[PDB]
Amino acid sequence: EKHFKYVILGGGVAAGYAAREFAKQGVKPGELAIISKEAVAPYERPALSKGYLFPQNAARLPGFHVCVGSGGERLLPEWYSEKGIELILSTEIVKADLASKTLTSAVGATFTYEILIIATGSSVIKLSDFGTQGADSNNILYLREVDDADKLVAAIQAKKGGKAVIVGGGYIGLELSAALKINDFDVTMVFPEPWCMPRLFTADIAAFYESYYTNKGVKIVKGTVAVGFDADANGDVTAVNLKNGSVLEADIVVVGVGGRPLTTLFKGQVAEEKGGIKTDAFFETSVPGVYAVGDVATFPMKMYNELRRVEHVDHARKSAEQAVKAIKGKESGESVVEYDYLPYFFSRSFDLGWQFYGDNVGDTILFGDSDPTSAKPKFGSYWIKDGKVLGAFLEGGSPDENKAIAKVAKTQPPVEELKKEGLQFASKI
Ligand SMILES: Cc1cc2nc3c(=O)[nH]c(=O)nc-3n(C[C@H](O)[C@H](O)[C@H](O)COP(=O)(O)OP(=O)(O)OC[C@H]3O[C@@H](n4cnc5c(N)ncnc54)[C@H](O)[C@@H]3O)c2cc1C
Ligand SMILES: NC(=O)c1ccc[n+]([C@@H]2O[C@H](COP(=O)([O-])OP(=O)(O)OC[C@H]3O[C@@H](n4cnc5c(N)ncnc54)[C@H](O)[C@@H]3O)[C@@H](O)[C@H]2O)c1
Ligand SMILES: O=C1O[C@H]([C@@H](O)CO)C(O)=C1O
């Protein structure tokens, strides 16, 4: 049995950034452990669908450990022991007793905390969860964690010049379709929605990304779903059967059909809401000295006066810091400012990349060009509700331009021929 004042449960983005803030706020050797089922120190998960997958000059660990991702220092394993932070790796926690402030591994081992941070992130939805016929075949791969990414790199090696099917039109599908395409696959994307990223992209924005993908050789199948997979004698996938009756041959299938907060260790013991562990503006759960951060938290969103959950890296980094800042700033009394999150989301693929700040509500306008034959494409969109601008999106922006639209989203300036001098409106705020 081991005892620590501070236990982080999860070896991910929030955990790494929590650790860095622990060290900034003067934590003393032996006081803090991070417990993780992964076999490596925390890292910048976004790299797994991008740089990790390049055919040359690829991100590899220890390169992308936190906090490089945001311009910070790179925390390698030796950083942690050097500071007496305990990296407890290859360790799945299967039982969590908030009552005893006690955690039990899979090996039966036992761990106590005074102060717990919950950063167990999100699961991957698998087609096997649904009982889909043949979803258990080989080379049907998911991508959450670096071992998944190493399995994806090996199948890419073994199957080059073959056929890839990407099941899903969210973030994963977008990036993984591009990455497979860059690694010399014939790629088809499959998804049921009217157009990709429908939770963020308008019809206009989606049509751009769809033409560009089409122009790059990616085939897109919409309005349907994978209802099953054929396999060969060895059990390797050979095709994807669709609900519309077509069959798509395949050597690799990559599925990105969403994620859920990894909260099962705590069902009952903590107030939940919108799928996540409910928290206040400091990331403390219903249970005193128990914190929840990153993808798992539902927390108050001051600036839209609402409870929200978000599944995004910027937020994992900051909520981790917030919680650490709220712990130490009650240890020594004083006071801490509440979390004030400006939503910030982004993605990159091929030569493209975009940013979104704010809330995607009310009516939209596009601006800039816009043309799928480049170059380099530079357009955006403003979301206007109640006269004010509420959200903005920008593809191919410079840093000045990106600070600009962020400043707009934060300030919510009012109104209207915005479509003439559109990017320009953001710079005059
Ligand atoms: C491939 C990919 C790309 C992404 N790209 C972007 C992007 O470009 N931009 C963006 O904004 N967001 C992106 N995200 C979103 C995501 O929010 C961040 O990647 C981030 O990881 C969230 O961090 P977290 O700490 O909350 O959870 P995680 O980083 O997932 O950390 C959870 C850690 O806890 C461990 N764990 C979980 N449960 C247990 C348990 N019961 N016992 C022991 N250990 C456990 C897990 O193994 C993991 O180590 C991406 C996500 C993925 C998967
Ligand atoms: N840039 C980024 O922000 C980024 C990049 C990669 C991953 N991620 C994160 O990783 C997690 C997983 O992402 P994801 O793209 O897998 O989920 P997502 O929630 O982004 O995508 C959900 C999509 O899956 C599709 N889908 C759902 N059920 C389906 C089915 N039965 N058949 C076919 N398609 C189906 C839908 O069209 C939907 O748009 C999320 O937390 C996400 O935020 C984020
Ligand atoms: O700007 C970003 O891109 C990186 C990613 O590739 C990791 O290095 C990341 O996480 C960001 O916040």
Author numbering: 4 to 418, 422 to 435
Provide the authors' original text about this structure.
To elucidate the detailed mechanism of the electron pathway adopted by OsMDHAR, we co-crystallized OsMDHAR with AsA, which is the final product of the enzyme, in the presence of NAD. We determined the structure of the catalytically compromised Y349F mutant in complex with AsA. Superposition of the Tyr349 and Phe349 of apo and mutant structure indicates that there is no conformational change of Phe349. However, we did not observe any large conformational changes in the structure of the OsMDHAR-NAD-AsA complex. The active site of OsMDHAR consists of highly positively charged electrostatic potential pockets, which easily bind to the negatively charged AsA, as shown in Fig. 6a. Structural studies revealed three highly conserved residues, G72, R320, and R351, positioned closed to the AsA molecule. Of these residues, Arg320 forms a hydrogen bond with AsA bound to the structure. Therefore, we suggest that R320 is important for substrate binding. The catalytic hydroxyl group of the active site Y349 residue was positioned within reasonable distance to be able to transfer electrons to O3 of AsA or ISD. The structural and mutagenesis studies suggest that the electron is transferred from the flavin N atom to the FAD flanking Tyr349, which subdivides the distance between FAD and AsA into two shorter segments of 5.7 and 3.8 Å, and then directly to the substrate, MDHA.
